[PDB]
Structure 1
Amino acid sequence: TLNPSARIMTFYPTMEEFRNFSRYIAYIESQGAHRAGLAKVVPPKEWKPRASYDDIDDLVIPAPIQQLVTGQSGLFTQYNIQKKAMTVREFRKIANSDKYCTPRYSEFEELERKYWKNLTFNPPIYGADVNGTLYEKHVDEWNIGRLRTILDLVEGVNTPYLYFGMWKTSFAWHTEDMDLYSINYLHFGEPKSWYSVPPEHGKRLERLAKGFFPGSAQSCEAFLRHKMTLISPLMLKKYGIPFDKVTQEAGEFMITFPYGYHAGFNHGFNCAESTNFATRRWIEYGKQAVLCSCRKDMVKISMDVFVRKFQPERYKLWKAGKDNTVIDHTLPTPEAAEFL
């Protein structure tokens, strides 16, 4: 009944609302935010995670990736080529050069058309998965480095990663590892555009992708976890896959929800910080997540600790294999009770 449209919702918390992260996640779920699989949270103007970003020029990007894209007719495969380490200074120079800078554009629709028309040409460099934070030590509100969710019970899923983008750099269709939530903050720079498929329609996307990449499907059941498959919004529209789009601007947060498929691209030189987190609602998703058998650096979490603590009644039944729980993607987290 809440957000029946499953459209991306935007939230504007006051400084008071913003102070308790986990409570605010529970609040947005009470509002139906989770149904779209992606939500935007604009922080109060007074909030800043770092005073300035002018001291990061010598920050090392250990493994930049040149993103080679192959395909046609809205279906593409992205291949990553690891390049040697570069500084933020060397990266920003390449990002803003004539070769790699953002093209001239009026409306977003124009930039998006240029993205889908040129993604296979002039492969850009993505300064992705840099272990680190740009948050100052004293920042207690929405600190990606120290979120303090139930995911902390596990103790690279709890650690922050930095992503230095340039025009046309992309993230392929995927859900988070272990079908967890994620938080993404755009520290500075040019926007980041996102596409999302509601969790309730996530199996329709997987079936479509399997139909298009049968070689990839037979090799690995969870082949989208490789984060190599790019599918244009027009292909999604053509095959009746429901989706929504949103542009994230500097100083805004994006939340991805369990089993929320998302993809997107960077408009130009930017920097985003990201991590995974959990709520009590996630435990069932973690228990039922279809994982990637083959690829290296694929995250796996032992669910045992979570079932023992939050589902003790179900522990023996689940470990036995008799746990037949069916996930209702429309239900908010149990923590959302105080708002319902």
Structure 2
Amino acid sequence: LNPSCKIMTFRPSMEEFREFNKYLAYMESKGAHRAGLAKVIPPKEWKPRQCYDDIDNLLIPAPIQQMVTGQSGLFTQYNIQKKAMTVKEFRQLANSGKYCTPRYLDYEDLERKYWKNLTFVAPIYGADINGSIYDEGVDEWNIARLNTVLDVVEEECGISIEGVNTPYLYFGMWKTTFAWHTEDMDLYSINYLHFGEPKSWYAIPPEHGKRLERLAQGFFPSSSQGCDAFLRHKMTLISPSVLKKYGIPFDKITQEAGEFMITFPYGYHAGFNHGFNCAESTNFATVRWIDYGKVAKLCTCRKDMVKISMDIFVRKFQPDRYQLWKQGKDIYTIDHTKPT
């Protein structure tokens, strides 16, 4: 299944698309998860929102200015908080001469310009804004209620899932960056690009994730000393030139407005926004995730990082293993290649 581990693009008919959980089972049956990342283009007629005009009025409480330092494919970034502004003000800022997308020939050209210009003007973004902007009543692929095993454990068993299964908005401009990371607890994520300019992605197959970790520890030995899972800080940038040089396998793809990207457990991803845009995302889980969550290597640094107790998931979905697990005896290494 997908021996190349390349990013797959899916084009479901309305009939296939209707049921998210079933279609996701189908994607993995084709080996989509080997790449760490997949794209799903919904059928043309499907619209999660009739009109986006009102989103201009939404407030972005804490826009962040992204300060990047380093050189030649290896960078670290930190955040400066700016004053609140409406999406409309943010779009006008994004479109100004100081912040707008440069002229470019094709995506390959724009990508070169991204990596060449990272340490000049510092771009601004709004992230982790709570809420979904789907219309009421949209029942397909509704990011606010995907009904995965996360939801079951929360609603049926009353277990806190720490807010990770709720929907968040991101408002990008040119050159705003998501640094290399896997999801909290090595969950899945889903990202829909509502409107605006594209978002480019890089992804490393989960089966090669440890090689990215070893390369990062080698280039960022300071960061590494402070925290065993320092890539979860989302402050570490590493270019595809550097990946190619040290032979870490990866793939790239660009997401356009109206398209979904799914990231899979332990699928390291990074990327950047082409221009002003708006994306909605959340985390979710399936049963195949449970063995990733049990071994996910967590940040020790700060007091507040997301940790979900695995107890309920092993007890309910892996009852055969539960006591072995609680006795520290459930030892395995994950097969990243097979469906569950």
Question: TM-score scaled to structure 2, two decimals?
Answer: 0.96
**1:296 Cα deviation (Å)?**
5.1
Match of 2:326 among 299, 315, 319: 319
Which residue of structure 2 aligns with residue 299 of structure 1?
306
Which residue of structure 1 aligns with residue 11 of structure 2?
12
Give SS of 2:287's match. Answer: coil
How do 1:132-211 and structure 2 match up within 5 A? 132-152=131-151, 153-154=153-154, 155=160, 156-211=163-218
**1:84 Cα deviation (Å)?**
2.1
**1:326 Cα deviation (Å)?**
1.5
Q: What is the root-mean-square deviation of aligned Cα atoms in Å?
A: 0.8
How far apart, in 1, do the equivalents of 2:51 and 2:77 lie? 34
Q: Which runs of 4+ in 1 moved over 3 A?
A: none
How far apart, in 2, do the equivalents of 1:295 and 1:60 lie? 28
Identity %: 81
How far apart, in 2, do the equivalents of 1:62 and 1:314 lie? 45
How far apart, in 2, do the equivalents of 1:87 and 1:305 lie? 41
Which residue of structure 1 aligns with residue 274 of structure 2?
267
**1:295 Cα deviation (Å)?**
3.0
How do 1:22-171 and structure 2 match up within 5 A? 22-152=21-151, 153-154=153-154, 155=160, 156-171=163-178
Listed as ranges, the gaps of 5+ residues in structure 2 are 155-159
Give SS of 2:316's match. Answer: helix
**1:246 Cα deviation (Å)?**
0.2
How far apart, in 1, do the equivalents of 2:106 and 2:43 lie? 27
How far apart, in 1, do the equivalents of 2:166 and 2:214 lie? 32
Which residue of structure 1 aligns with residue 339 of structure 2?
332
**1:297 Cα deviation (Å)?**
4.5
Cα 1:45–1:173 change in 2 (3 A) is: same
Which residue of structure 2 aligns with residue 257 of structure 1?
264
Alignment length (residue pairs): 332
Which residue of structure 1 aligns with residue 157 of structure 2?
none
How far apart, in 1, do the equivalents of 2:327 and 2:90 lie? 52
Listed as ranges, the gaps of 5+ residues in structure 1 are 334-340
Cα 1:296–1:54 change in 2 (3 A) is: farther
Contact kept in structure 2, 1:226 and 1:295, CA below 8 Å? no
Render the CA deviation track for 1:199-233: whole Å, top value 9, x for unaligned.
00000000000000111011100000000000000
